[PDB]
From Swiss-Prot:
Effect seen on changing S249A: 10-fold decrease in activity, and 9-fold decrease in substrate affinity
Residues of the active site: H125 (proton acceptor), K152 (schiff-base intermediate with substrate), K296 (for shikimate dehydrogenase activity), D334 (for shikimate dehydrogenase activity)
Any one GO cellular component localisation term in the record: chloroplast stroma
CDD domains for the chain: DHQase_I (cd00502), NAD_bind_Shikimate_DH (cd01065)
Organism: Arabidopsis thaliana (Mouse-ear cress)
Gene from which the chain derives: EMB3004
Catalysed reactions listed for this entry: 3-dehydroquinate = 3-dehydroshikimate + H2O; shikimate + NADP(+) = 3-dehydroshikimate + NADPH + H(+)
Name the UniProt record assigns to this protein: Bifunctional 3-dehydroquinate dehydratase/shikimate dehydrogenase, chloroplastic
């Protein structure tokens, strides 16, 4: 429905003068409007403070005076609360937000008294779940019947599949609709508004000033997710994982897509259940995915066709949806990225026997030295299907060999977790850690103190990523670009996108 989505910045400073500065920062960062959260002001003088904000804000203003019974801070008399919103209207507000619960009464109170530019948002907040399309439809119709100018519905993501229902609502409701799904599993709903008809999304001045769970920053919407480039035809890609908030795949693929003017967007996909995820997002809108822990093996099963390298590895880390028939094709770029990063570093000990361990184990037997796996669960086979070692024993273990961590051990926030004792590294000449967040794991740090050769996970991450770009876009992998993107935009640590 109609225009690209606006970016609204929530303004929650507890004093009038600080809110003024926040509206200025909102303007500097690129926000399109501000939501003035009046219920967050510590000492409020409505006529005075309202006049101040409207006079000084460089951006159009949306006033919200959220009561405690709708998730806000305001307590006290209800008519006084409404008096303030009407006051904001007659003082020159661009919008007010009024709760569905009181919306009929309130809109009646201003009938024939609205200024010309003024729109009334009527909102409903669901902190439990995301209702069925049938129940959302009825919600939309109820909000319309109050006389709302704009419909606002926030729901809660119990599973990421919930987001498809909200997209269906914003895409097809014939009324300007703000439709958002809260929580980390709902984050995709906040990014893709301009493709699915959303009127507005909330982006924060920074990650500390969140007004409801899941909101990204304005800067990430604009510069990381390329918000202004997203449109109805943009194809959606993403990193399927659990956890997923550490992933820098959205940073690199969005920069590459933008650099080559490819009409795609890459988001985080926090997926609990891989089967239901793929079923829920089967349309052509969702053109490909990357697959991380713990879904690499299940993805191989969910794919209709499987590349031989991935077939014979047992795991899929890249899913392409073929436009012809909607068919899911599965590839593996972990092998080449891992092995080639190690070869450039210069008997193989592979920590972990999940999808990433399978790809590295497979690759190593293919070229140079075919050797031994170590997993938490000892009995992870793979040392047989390729040519084992219980995790508790791996420290107790040649002088100048190799070791390759492919588990999540050491990944943020577990920065002091390491898969093996420092003293046991004396037996190793190269240590590779697929973990790239942080860049310097405890394992890699201690491995270097042990005088060994350290190849970081970023060497593997960038390599496997430009191979996925090639699969995703059908365009030649722009290797130099991806290194340059990772160097300039993927260097900061302790980043959580959630
Ligand atoms: O962190 C990430 O985004 C990923 C890491 C690796 O598992 C890759 O196999 C996956 O494709 C992307």
């Amino acid at each position: 429905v109609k225009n690209p989505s606006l970016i609204c910045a929530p303004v929650m400073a507890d004093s009038i003068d600080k809110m003024v500065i926040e509206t200025s920062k909102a303007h500097e960062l690129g926000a399109d409007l501000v939501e003035i959260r009046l219920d967050w002001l510590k000492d409020f003088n409505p006529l005075e403070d309202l006049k101040t904000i409207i006079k000084k804000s460089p951006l159009p203003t949306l006033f919200t005076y959220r009561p405690k019974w709708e998730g806000g801070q305001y307590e006290g008399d209800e008519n006084e609360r409404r008096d303030v919103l009407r006051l904001a209207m007659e003082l020159g507000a661009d919008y007010i937000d009024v709760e569905l619960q009181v919306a009929s009464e309130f809109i009646k109170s201003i009938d024939g008294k609205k200024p010309g530019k003024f729109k009334v948002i009527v909102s409903s907040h669901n902190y439990q779940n995301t209702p069925s399309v049938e129940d959302l439809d009825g919600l939309v119709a109820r909000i319309q019947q109050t006389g709302a100018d704009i419909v606002k519905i926030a729901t809660t993501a119990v599973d990421i599949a919930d987001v498809a229902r909200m997209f269906h609502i914003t895409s097809k409701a014939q009324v300007p609709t703000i439709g958002l799904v809260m929580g980390e599993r709902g984050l995709m709903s906040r990014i893709l508004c301009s493709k699915f008809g959303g009127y507005l999304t909330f982006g924060t001045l920074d990650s500390s000033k969140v007004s409801a769970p899941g909101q990204p920053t304005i800067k990430d919407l604009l510069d990381l997710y390329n918000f202004r480039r997203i449109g109805p035809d943009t194809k959606v890609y993403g990193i399927i994982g659990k956890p997923v908030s550490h992933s820098k795949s959205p940073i690199v693929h969005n920069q590459a897509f933008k650099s080559v003017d490819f009409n795609g967007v890459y988001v985080h996909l926090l997926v609990d259940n891989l089967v239901s995820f793929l079923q829920a997002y089967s349309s052509s809108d969702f053109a490909g995915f990357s697959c991380g822990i713990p879904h690499k093996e299940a993805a191989l099963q969910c794919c209709d066709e499987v590349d031989p390298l991935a077939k014979s590895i047992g795991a899929v880390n890249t899913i392409l949806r073929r436009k012809s028939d909607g068919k899911l094709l599965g590839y593996n770029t972990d092998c080449i990225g891992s092995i080639s990063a190690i070869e450039d570093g210069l008997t193989v000990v592979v920590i972990g026997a999940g999808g990433a361990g399978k790809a590295l184990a497979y690759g190593a037997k293919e070229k140079g030295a075919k050797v031994v796996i170590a997993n938490r669960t000892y009995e992870r086979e793979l040392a047989e299907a390729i040519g084992a070692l219980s995790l508790t024993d791996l420290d107790n273990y040649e002088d100048g060999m190799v070791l390759a961590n492919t588990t999540s051990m050491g990944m943020q926030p577990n920065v002091e977790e390491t898969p093996i004792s420092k003293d046991a590294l004396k037996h190793y000449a190269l240590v590779f850690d697929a973990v790239y967040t942080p860049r310097i794991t405890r394992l890699l740090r201690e491995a270097e103190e042990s005088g060994a050769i350290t190849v970081s996970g970023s060497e593997m991450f960038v390599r496997q990523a430009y191979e996925q770009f090639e699969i995703f876009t059908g365009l030649p992998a722009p290797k130099e670009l991806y290194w340059q993107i990772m160097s300039k935009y993927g260097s900061r640590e302790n980043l959580y996108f959630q």
